[PDB]
Amino acid sequence: IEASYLTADSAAHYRTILRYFYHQHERMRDFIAPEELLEHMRSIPAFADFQEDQLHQQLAQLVKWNNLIARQDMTNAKTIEEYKKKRFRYQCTPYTVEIERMIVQLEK
Amino acid sequence: DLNKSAEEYMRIWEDVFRYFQTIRTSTADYIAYINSEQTDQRMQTEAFLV
Amino acid sequence: QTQLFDEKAIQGMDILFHHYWILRAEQPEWYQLIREREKVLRRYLDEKFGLRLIVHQHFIKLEKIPVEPEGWMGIQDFQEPMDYAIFCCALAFLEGKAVDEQFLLSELCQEIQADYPGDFPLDWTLYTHRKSLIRAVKVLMEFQLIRTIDGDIGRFDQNEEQEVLYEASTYSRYFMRTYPDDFSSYQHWSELLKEDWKLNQEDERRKRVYRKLFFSPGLHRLDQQDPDFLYIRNYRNRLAEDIEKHSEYKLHVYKNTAFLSIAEPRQYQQVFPNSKASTDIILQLSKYIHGEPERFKANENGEILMTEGEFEQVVDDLRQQFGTGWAKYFRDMSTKGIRTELLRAMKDWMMAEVDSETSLIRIKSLTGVMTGEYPSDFQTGGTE
Numbered sequence A: 001i002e003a004s005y006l007t008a009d010s011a012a013h014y015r016t017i018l019r020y021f022y023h024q025h026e027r028m029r030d031f032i033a034p035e036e037l038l039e040h041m042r043s044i045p046a047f048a049d050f051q052e053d054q055l056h057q058q059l060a061q062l063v064k065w066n067n068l069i070a071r072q073d074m075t076n077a078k079t080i081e082e083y084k085k086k087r088f089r090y091q092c093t094p095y096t097v098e099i100e101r102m103i104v105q106l107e108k
Numbered sequence B: 001d002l003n004k005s006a007e008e009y010m011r012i013w014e015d016v017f018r019y020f021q022t023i024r025t026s027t028a029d030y031i032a033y034i035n036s037e038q039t040d041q042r043m044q045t046e047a048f049l050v
Numbered sequence C: 001q002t003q004l005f006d007e008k009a010i011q012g013m014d015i016l017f018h019h020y021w022i023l024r025a026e027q028p029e030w031y032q033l034i035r036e037r038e039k040v041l042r043r044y045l046d047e048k049f050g051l052r053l054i055v056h057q058h059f060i061k062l063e064k065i066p067v068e069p070e071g072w073m074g075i076q077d078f079q080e081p082m083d084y085a086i087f088c089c090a091l092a093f094l095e096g097k098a099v100d101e102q103f104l105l106s107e108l109c110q111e112i113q114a115d116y117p118g119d120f121p122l123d124w125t126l127y128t129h130r131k132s133l134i135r136a137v138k139v140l141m142e143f144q145l146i147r148t149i150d151g152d153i154g155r156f157d158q159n160e161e162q163e164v165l166y167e168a169s170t171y172s173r174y175f176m177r178t179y180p181d182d183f184s185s186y187q188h189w190s191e192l193l194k195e196d197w198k199l200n201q202e203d204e205r206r207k208r209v210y211r212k213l214f215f216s217p218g219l220h221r222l223d224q225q226d227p228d229f230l231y232i233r234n235y236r237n238r239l240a241e242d243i244e245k246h247s248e249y250k251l252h253v254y255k256n257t258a259f260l261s262i263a264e265p266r267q268y269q270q271v272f273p274n275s276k277a278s279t280d281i282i283l284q285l286s287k288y289i290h291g292e293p294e295r296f297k298a299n300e301n302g303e304i305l306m307t308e309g310e311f312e313q314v315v316d317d318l319r320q321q322f323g324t325g326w327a328k329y330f331r332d333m334s335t336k337g338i339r340t341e342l343l344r345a346m347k348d349w350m351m352a353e354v355d356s357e358t359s360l361i362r363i364k365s366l367t368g369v370m371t372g373e374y375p376s377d378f379q380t381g382g383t384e
Helices: A002-007 A011-026 A034-043 A052-064 A080-084 A094-107 B006-035 B037-042 C007-018 C028-036 C038-049 C081-094 C105-115 C127-142 C170-174 C190-196 C204-215 C227-234 C236-246 C277-290 C308-321 C335-348 C365-369 C376-383
Strands: A068-072 A088-092 C021-023 C053-055 C059-062 C102-104 C146-149 C165-168 C250-253 C257-261 C304-306 C352-354 C361-363
Touching: A002 A011, A002 A094, A011 A034, A011 A052, A011 A088, A011 A094, A034 A052, A052 A068, A080 C102, B006 B037, C007 C028, C007 C038, C007 C059, C007 C236, C021 C028, C028 C038, C028 C059, C038 C053, C038 C204, C059 C170, C081 C105, C081 C127, C102 C105, C105 C127, C105 C165, C127 C146, C204 C227, C204 C257, C227 C236, C236 C250, C257 C365, C277 C308, C277 C335, C277 C365, C304 C308, C308 C335, C308 C361, C335 C352
Parallel strands: none
Antiparallel strands: A068 A088, C021 C059, C053 C059, C102 C165, C146 C165, C250 C257, C304 C361, C352 C361
């Protein structure tokens, strides 16, 4: 399934997203929610105009591939809508960590 | 008082600022960890223990 | 090395009295000040008053249990019993929420509606019910029992669909004191007092007198043989010396009343006279009563007895003389409305009573302590 993220119709976005997940895990800050990933997407010039909806489509697609561990964010909120939203937080699976480590090692 | 070769000085500077940039990256990452909203949401669970 | 009651202890005592409680997170200076002398404060309060001073990690609180409850004591932002009922129900709801748990205003409204114990259901389609809920929530927020995640409750007045996200703060646990038995076994609030004084049989009289003096604006002689007033009469000098030593106040004693005056009231204190216009008319009425001693000869207990008609006539006379200088609020209102407002004000200060049965008005001797008048140049100006 991982080959899909490596070479699917959004392989660039998938690679960037899992690379940010790997970055945050290597610093032990892995249980990330969509907002910081959206910020990272907007940081890169190519995806600078990113949107939350496309991010959610791709992330749901990924959790279908078990790239991530999904938790429901029922513990705290900052706005009324945020409270009403059944948000989620995501953590990368060990397999994802290892594959991204191999890709980074080839990069090195 | 500058009574030695230039290569020694370049090596000394290289070591100094390689290590200083190492420490600078370390402090940037560590302060990001401390400030992490991951921590701020992680207070509400056992994950805070982690 | 031993502690002594000093400027810091006096300041701490005043801060304890004039607030319900002091929170570390918001009043760190006051919390620190109170704690340092907390040993001396505990000793003094226990010996003389008998109040239990509760010192905790997050707050300091003085359980000011009154000798005889009086109207002004209660939470003033509330105006109807329903507000108190909704307040208590909201507290009951907060017992179900863990610290820093977040709940929406709709959930709180629903739970309050469900629990509300009256025969008549609580309904949110009304205006008055929503206003009552907003006042209850405002008082709750005043004590930091619940924090506000951004939103706006004031809109709830005119938009029942309004929504808000609230957070239960830790203080909710400690707000209400503890009660002697299984509290449910009691049937009327009066039974609570009979308990709280069952713990203070030792020198009940001294604690009684001190509580009445410090809490109430005044202490009225019940009859010719009132034991509290007899106690004060027997120990006037040492009472005055002790009170001067331990606080800013200075004692006064009369044939029919006793009270503590304050010379330099700080910002947070409440005192009479004050800005509210109704006091002006109270001072003018006091002067008018002074001016006709034979007509308003006080009975032996110091009360002056007048019927609603006689009081309204007096108020009309005042509106004739000094009405030109009254606030425009009263200048435009009929006599009976002024009578009602003035009597509410005088009730708050224990200046007078409305007789339950005969509707007779009793003006207490405390009113005659102070008299007020306009400057002579305006009064001559009023003549022009």
